[PDB]
């Protein structure tokens, strides 16, 4: 499973013009579910994402994770992260997850976030969305399990 995370000052997802998910400071998590993922992997990824020390302390050093910073998490499914982009001008998608299993793992990841007492927001699993955000830094990390 892949989590391409961006530290944000704000982020929102609109589906058909209406806001379906919106947060202030925190993380925008683009989640890519892979063919062989399971809850165990989703769990470890969630753990790593929420514990990643990339938020400024009361003095300016990155020593705090999103929970300590009091930030939120906006999770959006991104099938393109699991793409094979090794060669050529066209991505190939075969390492991606199946139809249903993908949503199940996505929902699971989101629920695990909420279970960690995180103010969590989402976008409809496979809907065409416009994700607005302000990447603060910028700070962007590729996490994968």
Residue 122: both structure tokens together: 């989402």
The site partner of 61 among Zn ion, a copy of itself, none (C-beta below 5 to 8 Å per kind) is none
Site size toward Zn ion (CB under 5 A) is: 6
Q: Which helix (H) or strand (E) holds 118?
A: none
Active site residue 78: yes
Contact in structure between 20 and 124 (CB atoms under 8 Å):
yes
Of the candidates 90, 72, 88, the residue with the CA atom closest to the CA atom of residue 80: 90
In the list 114, 126, 134, 140, the residue contacting Zn ion (rule: CB under 5 A) is: 114
Answer yes or no whether residue 1 interacts with a copy of itself by CB under 8 A.
no
| DSSP symbol at 65 | -
Q: Where are the beta strands (DSSP E) in 71-114?
A: 72-77
Q: How far is the CB of 6 from Zn ion (least distance, A)?
A: 20
Q: How far is the CB of 140 from a copy of itself (least distance, A)?
A: 5
Q: Which helix (H) or strand (E) holds 32?
A: strand 26-32
Answer yes or no whether residue 25 interacts with a copy of itself by CB under 8 A.
no
In the complex, the residues that contact a copy of itself under the rule CB under 8 A are: 4, 9, 30, 48, 51-54, 65, 76, 78, 80-81, 83, 85, 89-91, 128-144
């Amino acid at each position: 499973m892949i989590a391409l995370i961006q530290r944000v000052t704000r982020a929102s997802v609109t589906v058909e013009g209406e806001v379906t998910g919106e947060i202030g400071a925190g993380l925008l998590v683009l989640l890519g579910v892979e063919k062989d993922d399971d809850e165990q992997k989703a769990n470890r990824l969630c753990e790593r994402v929420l514990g990643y020390r990339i938020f400024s302390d009361a003095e300016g050093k990155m020593n705090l994770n999103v929970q300590q910073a009091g930030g939120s998490v906006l999770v959006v499914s991104q099938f393109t992260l699991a793409a094979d982009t090794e060669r050529g001008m066209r991505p190939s998608f075969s390492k991606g997850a199946s139809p249903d299993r993908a949503e199940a793992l996505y929902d699971y990841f989101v629920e695990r976030c909420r279970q960690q007492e995180m103010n969590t927001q989402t976008g409809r699993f496979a809907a065409d969305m416009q994700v607005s955000l302000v990447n603060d830094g910028p700070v962007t990390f590729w996490l994968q399990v």
